[PDB]
Amino acid sequence: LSDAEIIQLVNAKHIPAYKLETLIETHERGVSIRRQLLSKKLSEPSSLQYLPYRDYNYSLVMGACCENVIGYMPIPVGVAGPLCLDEKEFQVPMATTEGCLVASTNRGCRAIGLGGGASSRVLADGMTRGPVVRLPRACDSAEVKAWLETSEGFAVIKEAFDSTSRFARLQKLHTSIAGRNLYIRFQSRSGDAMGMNMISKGTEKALSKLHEYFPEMQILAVSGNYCTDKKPAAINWIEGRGKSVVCEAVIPAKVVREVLKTTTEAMIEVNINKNLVGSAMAGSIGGYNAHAANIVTAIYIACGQDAAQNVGSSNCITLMEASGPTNEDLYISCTMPSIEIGTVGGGTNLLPQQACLQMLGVQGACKDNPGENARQLARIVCGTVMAGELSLMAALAAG
Amino acid sequence: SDAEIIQLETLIETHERGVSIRRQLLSKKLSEPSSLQYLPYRDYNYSLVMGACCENVIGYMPIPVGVAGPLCLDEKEFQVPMATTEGCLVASTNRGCRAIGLGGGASSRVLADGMTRGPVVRLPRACDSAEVKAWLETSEGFAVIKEAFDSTSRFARLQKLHTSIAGRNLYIRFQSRSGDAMGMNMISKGTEKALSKLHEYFPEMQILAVSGNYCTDKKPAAINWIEGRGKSVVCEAVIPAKVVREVLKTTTEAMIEVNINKNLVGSAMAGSIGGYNAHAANIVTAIYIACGQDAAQNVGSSNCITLMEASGPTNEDLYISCTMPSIEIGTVGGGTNLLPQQACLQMLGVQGACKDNPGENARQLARIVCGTVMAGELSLMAALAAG
Amino acid sequence: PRPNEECLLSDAEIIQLVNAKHIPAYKLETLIETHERGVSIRRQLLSKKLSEPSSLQYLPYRDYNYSLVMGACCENVIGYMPIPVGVAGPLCLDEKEFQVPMATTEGCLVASTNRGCRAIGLGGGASSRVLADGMTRGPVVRLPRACDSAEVKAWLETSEGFAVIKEAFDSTSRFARLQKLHTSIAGRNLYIRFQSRSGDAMGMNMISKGTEKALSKLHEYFPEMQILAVSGNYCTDKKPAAINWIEGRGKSVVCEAVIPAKVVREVLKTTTEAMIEVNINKNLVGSAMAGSIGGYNAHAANIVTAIYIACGQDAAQNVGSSNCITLMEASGPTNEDLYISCTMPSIEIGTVGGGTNLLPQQACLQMLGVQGACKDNPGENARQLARIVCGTVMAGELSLMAALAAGH
Amino acid sequence: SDAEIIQLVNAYKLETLIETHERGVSIRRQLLSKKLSEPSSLQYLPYRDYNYSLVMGACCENVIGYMPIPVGVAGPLCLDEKEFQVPMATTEGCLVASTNRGCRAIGLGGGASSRVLADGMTRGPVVRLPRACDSAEVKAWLETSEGFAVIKEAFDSTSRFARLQKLHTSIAGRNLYIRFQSRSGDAMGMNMISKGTEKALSKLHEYFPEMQILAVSGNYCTDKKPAAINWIEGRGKSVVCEAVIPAKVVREVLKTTTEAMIEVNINKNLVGSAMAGSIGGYNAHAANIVTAIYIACGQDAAQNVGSSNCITLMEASGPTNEDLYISCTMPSIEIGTVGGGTNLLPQQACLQMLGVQGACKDNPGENARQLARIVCGTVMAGELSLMAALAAG
Ligand SMILES: CC(C)c1c(C(=O)Nc2ccccc2)c(-c2ccccc2)c(-c2ccc(F)cc2)n1CC[C@@H](O)C[C@@H](O)CC(=O)O
Ligand SMILES: CC(C)c1c(C(=O)Nc2ccccc2)c(-c2ccccc2)c(-c2ccc(F)cc2)n1CC[C@@H](O)C[C@@H](O)CC(=O)O
Ligand SMILES: CC(C)c1c(C(=O)Nc2ccccc2)c(-c2ccccc2)c(-c2ccc(F)cc2)n1CC[C@@H](O)C[C@@H](O)CC(=O)O
Ligand SMILES: CC(C)c1c(C(=O)Nc2ccccc2)c(-c2ccccc2)c(-c2ccc(F)cc2)n1CC[C@@H](O)C[C@@H](O)CC(=O)O
Ligand SMILES: Nc1ncnc2c1ncn2[C@@H]1O[C@H](COP(=O)(O)OP(=O)(O)O)[C@@H](O)[C@H]1O
Ligand SMILES: Nc1ncnc2c1ncn2[C@@H]1O[C@H](COP(=O)(O)OP(=O)(O)O)[C@@H](O)[C@H]1O
Numbered sequence A: 001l002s003d004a005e006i007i008q009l010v011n012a013k014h015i016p017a018y019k020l021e022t023l024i025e026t027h028e029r030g031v032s033i034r035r036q037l038l039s040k041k042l043s044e045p046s047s048l049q050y051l052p053y054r055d056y057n058y059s060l061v062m063g064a065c066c067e068n069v070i071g072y073m074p075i076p077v078g079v080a081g082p083l084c085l086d087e088k089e090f091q092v093p094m095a096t097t098e099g100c101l102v103a104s105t106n107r108g109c110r111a112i113g114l115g116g117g118a119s120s121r122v123l124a125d126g127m128t129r130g131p132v133v134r135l136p137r138a139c140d141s142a143e144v145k146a147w148l149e150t151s152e153g154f155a156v157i158k159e160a161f162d163s164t165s166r167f168a169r170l171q172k173l174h175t176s177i178a179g180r181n182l183y184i185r186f187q188s189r190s191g192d193a194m195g196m197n198m199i200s201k202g203t204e205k206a207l208s209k210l211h212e213y214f215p216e217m218q219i220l221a222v223s224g225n226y227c228t229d230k231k232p233a234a235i236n237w238i239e240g241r242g243k244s245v246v247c248e249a250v251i252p253a254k255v256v257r258e259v260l261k262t263t264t265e266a267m268i269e270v271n272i273n274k275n276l277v278g279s280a281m282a283g284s285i286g287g288y289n290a291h292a293a294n295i296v297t298a299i300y301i302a303c304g305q306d307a308a309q310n311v312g313s314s315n316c317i318t319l320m321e322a323s324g325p326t327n328e329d330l331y332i333s334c335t336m337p338s339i340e341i342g343t344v345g346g347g348t349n350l351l352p353q354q355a356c357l358q359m360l361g362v363q364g365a366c367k368d369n370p371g372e373n374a375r376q377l378a379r380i381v382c383g384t385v386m387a388g389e390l391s392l393m394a395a396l397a398a399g
Numbered sequence B: 001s002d003a004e005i006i007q008l009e010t011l012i013e014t015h016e017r018g019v020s021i022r023r024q025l026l027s028k029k030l031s032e033p034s035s036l037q038y039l040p041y042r043d044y045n046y047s048l049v050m051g052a053c054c055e056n057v058i059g060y061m062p063i064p065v066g067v068a069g070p071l072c073l074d075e076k077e078f079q080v081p082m083a084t085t086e087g088c089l090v091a092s093t094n095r096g097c098r099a100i101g102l103g104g105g106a107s108s109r110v111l112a113d114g115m116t117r118g119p120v121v122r123l124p125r126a127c128d129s130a131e132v133k134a135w136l137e138t139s140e141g142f143a144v145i146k147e148a149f150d151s152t153s154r155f156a157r158l159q160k161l162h163t164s165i166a167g168r169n170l171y172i173r174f175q176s177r178s179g180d181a182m183g184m185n186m187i188s189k190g191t192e193k194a195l196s197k198l199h200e201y202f203p204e205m206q207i208l209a210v211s212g213n214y215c216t217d218k219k220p221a222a223i224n225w226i227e228g229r230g231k232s233v234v235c236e237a238v239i240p241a242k243v244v245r246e247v248l249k250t251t252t253e254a255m256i257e258v259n260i261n262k263n264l265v266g267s268a269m270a271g272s273i274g275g276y277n278a279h280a281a282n283i284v285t286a287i288y289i290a291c292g293q294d295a296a297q298n299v300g301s302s303n304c305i306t307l308m309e310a311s312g313p314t315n316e317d318l319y320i321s322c323t324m325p326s327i328e329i330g331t332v333g334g335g336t337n338l339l340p341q342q343a344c345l346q347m348l349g350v351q352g353a354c355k356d357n358p359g360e361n362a363r364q365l366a367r368i369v370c371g372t373v374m375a376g377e378l379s380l381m382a383a384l385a386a387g
Numbered sequence C: 001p002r003p004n005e006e007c008l009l010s011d012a013e014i015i016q017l018v019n020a021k022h023i024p025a026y027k028l029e030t031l032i033e034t035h036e037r038g039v040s041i042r043r044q045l046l047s048k049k050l051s052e053p054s055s056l057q058y059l060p061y062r063d064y065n066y067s068l069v070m071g072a073c074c075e076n077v078i079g080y081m082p083i084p085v086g087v088a089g090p091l092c093l094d095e096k097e098f099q100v101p102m103a104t105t106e107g108c109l110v111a112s113t114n115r116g117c118r119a120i121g122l123g124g125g126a127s128s129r130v131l132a133d134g135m136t137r138g139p140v141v142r143l144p145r146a147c148d149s150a151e152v153k154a155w156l157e158t159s160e161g162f163a164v165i166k167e168a169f170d171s172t173s174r175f176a177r178l179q180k181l182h183t184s185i186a187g188r189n190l191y192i193r194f195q196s197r198s199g200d201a202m203g204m205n206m207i208s209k210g211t212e213k214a215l216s217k218l219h220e221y222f223p224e225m226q227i228l229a230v231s232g233n234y235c236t237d238k239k240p241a242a243i244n245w246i247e248g249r250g251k252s253v254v255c256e257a258v259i260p261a262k263v264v265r266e267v268l269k270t271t272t273e274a275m276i277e278v279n280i281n282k283n284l285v286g287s288a289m290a291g292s293i294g295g296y297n298a299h300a301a302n303i304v305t306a307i308y309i310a311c312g313q314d315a316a317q318n319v320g321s322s323n324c325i326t327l328m329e330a331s332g333p334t335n336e337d338l339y340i341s342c343t344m345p346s347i348e349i350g351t352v353g354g355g356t357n358l359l360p361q362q363a364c365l366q367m368l369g370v371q372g373a374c375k376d377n378p379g380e381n382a383r384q385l386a387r388i389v390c391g392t393v394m395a396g397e398l399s400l401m402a403a404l405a406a407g408h
Numbered sequence D: 001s002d003a004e005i006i007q008l009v010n011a012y013k014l015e016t017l018i019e020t021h022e023r024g025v026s027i028r029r030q031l032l033s034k035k036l037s038e039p040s041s042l043q044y045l046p047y048r049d050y051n052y053s054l055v056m057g058a059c060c061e062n063v064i065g066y067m068p069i070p071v072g073v074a075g076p077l078c079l080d081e082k083e084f085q086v087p088m089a090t091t092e093g094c095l096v097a098s099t100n101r102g103c104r105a106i107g108l109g110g111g112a113s114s115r116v117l118a119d120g121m122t123r124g125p126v127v128r129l130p131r132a133c134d135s136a137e138v139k140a141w142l143e144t145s146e147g148f149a150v151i152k153e154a155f156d157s158t159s160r161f162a163r164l165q166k167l168h169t170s171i172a173g174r175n176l177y178i179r180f181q182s183r184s185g186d187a188m189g190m191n192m193i194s195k196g197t198e199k200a201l202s203k204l205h206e207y208f209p210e211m212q213i214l215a216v217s218g219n220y221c222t223d224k225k226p227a228a229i230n231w232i233e234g235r236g237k238s239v240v241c242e243a244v245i246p247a248k249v250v251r252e253v254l255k256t257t258t259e260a261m262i263e264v265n266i267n268k269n270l271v272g273s274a275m276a277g278s279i280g281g282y283n284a285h286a287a288n289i290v291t292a293i294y295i296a297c298g299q300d301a302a303q304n305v306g307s308s309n310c311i312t313l314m315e316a317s318g319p320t321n322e323d324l325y326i327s328c329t330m331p332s333i334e335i336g337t338v339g340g341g342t343n344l345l346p347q348q349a350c351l352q353m354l355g356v357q358g359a360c361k362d363n364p365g366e367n368a369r370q371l372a373r374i375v376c377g378t379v380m381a382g383e384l385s386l387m388a389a390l391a392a393g
């Protein structure tokens, strides 16, 4: 059949769009038909002219990453580096449309390299899901909380949770009561995957098992916002979520002077009064930094991460202090307790994003040490954030 | 030739060639030099990017764009572009749009409009910073600061000042309209000239940083939640019991119970400031990427309180509202200057400046975002309530 | 113990009437001769109901002025609770000297605060400024639709809309002068934060009366508006809230002082460098790691609470009144002197009304020279008290911080 | 004579220098009177006939008298099948009356039930290592079962009630914040937990000599300052209480309806507190009740800052959904029945009134737990009454 004939068929059969994929056979043609169909529903039918769609691998997207596809959005990818981190050198891909961001981050990388590099450590690793359940009375929910805190109750819960996956290993439970409601924060490792779907599956089976001991328990929602996913929350800041990371470096006074165009003293004064006092006056929870979100977002988009997780992933406290023999060298550290990231699944299944992951040497699963690729990616993110903090802070300090 | 050049858009001719060479140079520094093969770069207009949106360019990252709609908002119909890699997001949001359309559509209102910049300055003593604060709060002091701020642009118009003291430090939050631009650069230029003028009245004042994190830009902050930043928007709709039953697969009562206990109580137990919603960030992020917005601003732009109530003659219909006090957005400048993103903006009829009434396109885009968020909230909440 | 019909005197007989006619114990001072035997009977009625009838033995009740407490400060009175009052000072503030009364049961608190005052005095004193003054009340109202509540918000934001509201608000008292309106929307709900001066009074009752009259006026223009609650927690009163921290509530105050290196060494037993490092890592970084909003200090609450109890303030207001950011930095020719400042944006306080009407608390207020209304300049006594509180807090911060810096 | 003693001084060593306590106070008062802009201002500040024996060198210094706070009683509070007569020290008119009305509605509803969910006072010191890599190593060390046991042994060796439970650590570059949590019998426990923290830190220092103990309290406890950590992880006693008020009682005692109360609770205590940017303040006036009971019972009133954290929830229940279900959850009630101001006779009297004075001989900590339950129950009574008044107008 012809395009116009498919169009007539879809319009004359009230067959909702998007079903084009199962209707036709080729992937790009279904996309071309949906764009044509959509075009007649717009005040400017030619508005899709510059929205590219051709020569793109839609097989990996369909049934996995997006629906009602009408094309793709190209985000410029720049590179910042080398980032000298833990005695290795990384060339960091950054997808952004903000001018000077890559340049500024690159300058930061330069100052770190000339300073002998940066060191980083993964402090914790565990994705979470925090469902909300209800009991008839608060006295009952209290009983469930006490039961879940015994070694016997936990083991049975861990047992049912762990049985849904090879990588699902329940670490701990933080429960919280609000009258007859009970919020249960399940935390578990997830190999190299960010882990949402995996932890969710585990949580559902665990809640099913919990319901066998407490038949009167009502499962209100698999997510009761106690995770907390994609919303700002003190719980992620205080207890961590995903990967908690810290990185540090010392920048020689000469480098601060020549590369950063400022002094260690001026940098410290700006850090304390902007990142600590300013954030405090603004009523911030977890936003004790200059622009971690810029770096997190740019790397996330380039590497197939869930960019909406930039909300909590960007949590960061940037600290600066005088170091060295004469207290003229700049010590800097960035602590990020909740980097939600992965190197397998979701958008990391797509080839262009796998390319950016390969650039860093962390694409896909780490066979001999599950989770190591994801941990390495989190360290790179924390290191690039520190590079970004150094540069922007120097620019603010200099004027 | 592609060889002894190693021995770029500033030197060479073609833009696409400079990228090829940059990719070649970078290739030699990679553990897996072949990785760059699946990273696209050809047939892309780098002219608009170079010197404006990105540096050290090695290609571009394609983000699948799906469409959700029609979104029946304020008696208009919108086809919403969403750039995402999260499966079922577009489908779920589309389902939400469906429920709203069958309910007679959604209504929205822009409550406030004003981008901010909050520099930190210091005086010798707290007694001096207090004097500067008092002067900034007089009608004459504001008038002179406003005269100086507004002289930097045709679109920059200072609306108000909120000053806060921390001993000898003084944080000044400048809030101004910025036409159809998100306004960061414009407001920053205005802030610098205003601070310069302030310095003439108080020579002992030290300008510590043009941004003292009191804006607050790209970090979570109660100040953006309470006072707004960019566009403050509210939207609402009533979904008929039958639609909740047939499209959403649940009941009004179940939806309400989930909203209260998840979006209100749950977020409260989590210690959230501004995160009284299910997944506004998913919608904000997807639209932001497709429309050339600054995706990092998703941090504060996603602030939202979702409310659900029993409505109608028999209290069986679902009333829903989403209030978003800090949508940082624009239809001119930055990534909106690129053609593919302009295409998504054109889809919504808000591309570029609204020559007649500067700001209307940006205000319309903020209303669409708030409306799409409500569609997304409706669908995901129904799915959680139904199990 | 005469029968009931005969009883028109005698404790045992009153008790029999109370039990038999089931007339409540609070109706006692309204039926009994003196205030004192009225509570006596009450304690006796209560004592019978306890698992240990002797419990009240050491709870004082005699020789106390209940006339001022009745129908004003407390109900079902069974006595009074004595809180030890100590004095810290002199506090050299704004070229004046204050002897600060502190009611507390925490050992070493007055001593430590006194040491702080000493370091300040030897440093040339402290300076303070009142940055803002205005008590608030934040009611919640509802409109049928969010589009309507948005309309009310815009109306309240026009110059004419504000004038009619202000006119209504101000007609309730000579001191009620509406300053501004902060309005916030949540769907069809509308939260309105009314802010106004209140002379020397803390102002809750006054601002509330003004808010009710203003809401009725608003109701005339928007008849479909439902007044859900005179307080929708948007004030915010007695609960932690970022809004009080960011916009202030009551009196916003800042105080500062410079402590000479020698004084930090000899009086505080530490160095300026050590103090600064503890302040930054405890009051800034530590509070940040703890997820604090407004708690960037060491123990402002100890000082605020002690002064509030001694001066008849509402001690429950210690929740927001204690908000404070303490900052320390190197000062002087050789950067060896300690610069310190305390910023408190929401001190809820008053020198007239409530517990300040009682004699013992008026005594503590008199000690500071701020008791009652300031005839010549309304509000000045309350402002002076707020400055004293901020200054005493700084004295307390200096001493405790030095003790943390020095020992361990 | 007072006159000659005064000329001698021309100091705050009065109690030691002389003999009788009351006279010491008398003399300090006379000396202070000459420094005041108004010499007779102390006239109505009482000071006579007071057992300063227990106060001198334990509860207050430079004593010049005492401040009388009116004590009222609210009750009976029907809680967990028991009846309590609750002492409330306040100067706020109608507070006791309103709280009493709340108690009445609860009693007529069949009483309230409560549960202690957690119990453990905390202290959060801040230490520093040369590098973030070192602090990370200490964090990992503290997380192993062996490293924990060693710290726990040193902590528990300091006192009879020092049982170190979970250990929460947090890193900020080279800084390390360690939240020590432990039971403390019937004592509020700050002094005890502090003593335990110091020995534990010395033991930790033996394994990590490069570690600098910056401050025994790094504000990570967190004591007397608002903090999300206390709300989320609890501090002291975490308690929950609940009750169901029959429609008729809501109508006759509270002068309103269940529907009206629910609408006010949701829009004020949840939405309003959310719009205000509150962390832990999802209630109407828990602080009023916490403060009044704390003052009357010798607690540390400054701890009302975190002790008043509370989320009040209301729901329609019953056959026709006209009855009122109510719950109050308070995760951080810092309280005790031994030590500090509870050592004073008048406050012990108020504690006795509740049957929780001093140590619980048979079951250590039970008196303090009982007092926390009473506080949470009285808060719920206060929430019910004020909410009804706001609902009614
Ligand atoms: C490119 C970017 C990092 C940048 C620079 C810079 O580093 N230029 C650069 C280019 C090449 C090499 C090295 C550096 C300067 C920048 C800052 C000072 C001086 C010069 C450039 C700014 C910027 C930040 C706040 C302003 F008000 C104005 C501009 N910005 C914008 C950052 C913005 O997104 C987030 C910010 O708003 C968060 C905050 O601080 O609250
Ligand atoms: C696609 C997406 C919106 C979705 C659905 C859904 O609506 N499916 C859909 C598809 C087609 C038509 C209609 C609906 C369900 C979803 C939820 C319940 C039942 C079925 C699907 C979920 C999801 C959310 C939380 C979970 F624990 C597990 C899955 N998710 C993932 C949401 C995630 O990003 C953010 C979330 O974590 C934030 C939160 O709530 O804390
Ligand atoms: C008396 C009090 C202020 C004090 C001192 C002191 O200054 N002693 C004093 C006596 C005489 C003269 C001069 C000084 C020391 C104190 C501190 C260090 C060294 C000596 C005394 C402490 C104290 C604070 C935290 C601890 F872990 C232990 C004790 N405390 C208890 C304060 C407490 O309530 C609030 C606190 O918990 C808030 C915080 O910091 O988190
Ligand atoms: C006595 C007190 C509990 C009270 C009542 C009341 O219950 N009266 C009472 C007396 C006897 C029997 C039964 C009831 C009413 C009250 C409320 C409504 C109607 C009647 C009385 C109020 C009060 C609270 C906020 C206002 F704006 C005005 C008044 N207040 C003052 C409470 C105040 O401290 C804390 C409050 O500000 C916190 C908040 O809600 O934000
Ligand atoms: N309607 C409009 N609204 C805003 N800016 C406009 C408009 N029309 C043209 N402009 C131009 O675009 C600029 C804003 O874009 P840009 O310089 O990239 O800064 P920003 O970071 O604020 O977006 C304005 O300074 C002005 O020169
Ligand atoms: N019991 C106390 N009452 C009041 N102030 C005290 C008390 N103990 C100490 N101080 C305060 O602490 C400071 C330290 O004095 P002191 O304890 O005698 O030690 P030092 O001799 O080392 O100065 C004094 O300036 C005083 O203000």
Ligand SMILES: Nc1ncnc2c1ncn2[C@@H]1O[C@H](COP(=O)(O)OP(=O)(O)O)[C@@H](O)[C@H]1O
Residues within 6 Å of the ligand: C173, C175, C198, C199, C200, C201, C202, C203, C204, C205, C206, C207, C350, C352, C353, C354, C372, C373, C374, C378, C379
């Ligand atoms: N200088 C003053 N400042 C404040 N109130 C004053 C003053 N002089 C007299 N008053 C009166 O005292 C009262 C303040 O006390 P009160 O009614 O208990 O309310 P609040 O809760 O504000 O203390 C008001 O009625 C007011 O008329």
Ligand SMILES: Nc1ncnc2c1ncn2[C@@H]1O[C@H](COP(=O)(O)OP(=O)(O)O)[C@@H](O)[C@H]1O
Residues within 6 Å of the ligand: C026, C075, C076, D096, D097, D098, D100, D101, D102, D104
């Ligand atoms: N002075 C008071 N002391 C104690 N409780 C009081 C007082 N006034 C009112 N109440 C409470 O209010 C309830 C009844 O209120 P209401 O019907 O207004 O009558 P009244 O105020 O005359 O007691 C009583 O059961 C009691 O709990």
Ligand SMILES: Nc1ncnc2c1ncn2[C@@H]1O[C@H](COP(=O)(O)OP(=O)(O)O)[C@@H](O)[C@H]1O
Residues within 6 Å of the ligand: D159, D160, D161, D184, D185, D186, D187, D188, D189, D190, D191, D192, D336, D338, D339, D340, D359, D360, D361, D364, D365
């Ligand atoms: N049941 C008990 N609970 C608590 N402390 C007890 C008990 N029995 C005896 N004690 C003693 O009381 C001490 C606690 O009082 P105190 O030192 O004043 O500190 P705090 O007031 O900070 O709790 C314990 O160290 C112990 O010696």
